[PDB]
Nucleic acid binder design. Structure first.
Ligand SMILES: *CC[C@H](OP(*)(=O)O)[C@H](O)COP(=O)(O)O
Ligand SMILES: [Mn+2]
Ligand SMILES: [Mn+2]
Ligand SMILES: [Mn+2]
Ligand SMILES: [Mn+2]
Ligand SMILES: [Mn+2]
Ligand SMILES: [Mn+2]
Ligand SMILES: [Mn+2]
Ligand SMILES: [Mn+2]
Ligand SMILES: [Mn+2]
Ligand SMILES: [Mn+2]
Ligand SMILES: [Mn+2]
Length: 325
DNA sequence: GTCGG
DNA sequence: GCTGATGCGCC
DNA sequence: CCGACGGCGCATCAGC
């Protein structure tokens, strides 16, 4: 792991800023720094060298220098000693508990998994499912299991209506040998950007997946997005997070670009669009006017067309992952 | 925390 | 009810 | 207090 110490240091600062400081822009600055340094194909020797990379300024340069000399960072040492900061950071790793709820719980004397399990009545439904499956959701999914999960979802969606098309996106579509969860992009002809012909399009698929006891629990559910829990039939497999996103059929290419990721790739791509005078979301690419307001959607017949508009060399899903050297 | 302006 | 903001999450 | 930083779904509350 080339520059592993520096990238792990910056990831740890990132998590502190998001979870304790609630500084989401400092979080994203530390992650940018970590991603660019992790992609750099040379061992960094000084802070002055790293400063040449985009997202590495004076401050990050000065703690690369410190880390390289001492193999540690006083700031991070002091943060780890802070049992309050440690407990907040930990509680946010539970789904439904974010920086705000985590701080409220720690200030009311909930510092550990045991304390959390005793105070189950303080938790809403989401937080309760997040706690119940905390251990399971920490495990990654082997690709062999993702293929099992893909077979079940495709088959049940087909049985509801053959006109449905389900695409497993996220790290799976980027060709990862393990994934954190299963992300399913769903389309149907009856749902487009300008018309809803059929109601309950996402609900019908979730109900079928619940009927065959694949989906076991619901975190959140609306008209276009489902967030819940699934499990493979035993031959017990761990419980897995599943996201299902229903996208307008005429906006599939913008939808699949978003849901394929990575999260850092999307952020960088959408940031470059703004430089070139475009705004990208999961539905459309729109030009920004003189005002800075979004005009009419531009025509998209492929993922590559979106790249072409912002003058980016097309990257295959495999090349949209984060990498190390 | 970086960086454009 | 709608709009806006906060807090949770997705890539 | 230079101020933007990717963009948005779902859940809930505040103000109208
Ligand atoms: C990394 C050091 C900090 O950079 P940022 O603009 O989050 C500060 O320069 C020092 O942190 P403080 O000593 O806690 O103010
Ligand atoms: Mn490796
Ligand atoms: Mn590289
Ligand atoms: Mn620089
Ligand atoms: Mn959490
Ligand atoms: Mn207490
Ligand atoms: Mn209680
Ligand atoms: Mn995923
Ligand atoms: Mn997911
Ligand atoms: Mn650029
Ligand atoms: Mn993710
Ligand atoms: Mn500022």
């Amino acid at each position: 792991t080339l520059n592993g110490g520096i990238t792990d240091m910056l990831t740890e600062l990132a998590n502190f800023e998001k979870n304790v400081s609630q500084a989401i822009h400092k979080y994203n600055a530390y992650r940018k720094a970590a991603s660019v340094i992790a992609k750099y194909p040379h061992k960094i020797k000084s802070g002055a060298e790293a400063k040449k990379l985009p997202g590495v300024g004076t401050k990050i340069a000065e703690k690369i220098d410190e880390f390289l000399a001492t193999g540690k960072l006083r700031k991070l040492e002091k943060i780890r000693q802070d049992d309050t900061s440690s407990s907040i950071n930990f509680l946010t790793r539970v789904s439904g508990i974010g920086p705000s709820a985590a701080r409220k719980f720690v200030d009311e004397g909930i510092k550990t998994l045991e304390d959390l399990r005793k105070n189950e009545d303080k938790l809403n439904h989401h937080q309760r499912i997040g706690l119940k499956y905390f251990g399971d959701f920490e495990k990654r999914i082997p690709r062999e299991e993702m293929l099992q999960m893909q077979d079940i979802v495709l088959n049940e969606v087909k049985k509801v209506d053959s006109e449905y098309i389900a695409t497993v996106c996220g790290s799976f579509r980027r060709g990862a040998e393990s994934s954190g969860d299963m992300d399913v992009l769903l389309t149907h002809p009856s749902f487009t950007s300008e018309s809803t012909k059929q109601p309950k399009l996402l609900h019908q698929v979730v109900e079928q997946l619940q009927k065959v006891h694949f989906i076991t629990d619901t975190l959140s559910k609306g008209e276009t997005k489902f967030m819940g829990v699934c499990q493979l039939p035993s031959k017990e497999y761990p419980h897995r997070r599943i996201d299902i996103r229903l996208i307008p059929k005429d906006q599939y290419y913008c939808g699949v670009l978003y849901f394929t990721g990575s999260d850092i790739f999307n952020k960088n791509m959408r940031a470059h669009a703004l430089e070139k005078g475009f705004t990208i979301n999961e539905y459309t690419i729109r030009p920004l006017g003189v005002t800075g307001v979004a005009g009419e959607p531009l025509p998209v017949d492929s993922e590559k067309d979106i790249f072409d508009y912002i003058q980016w060399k097309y990257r295959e899903p495999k090349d949209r992952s984060e990498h190390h050297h």
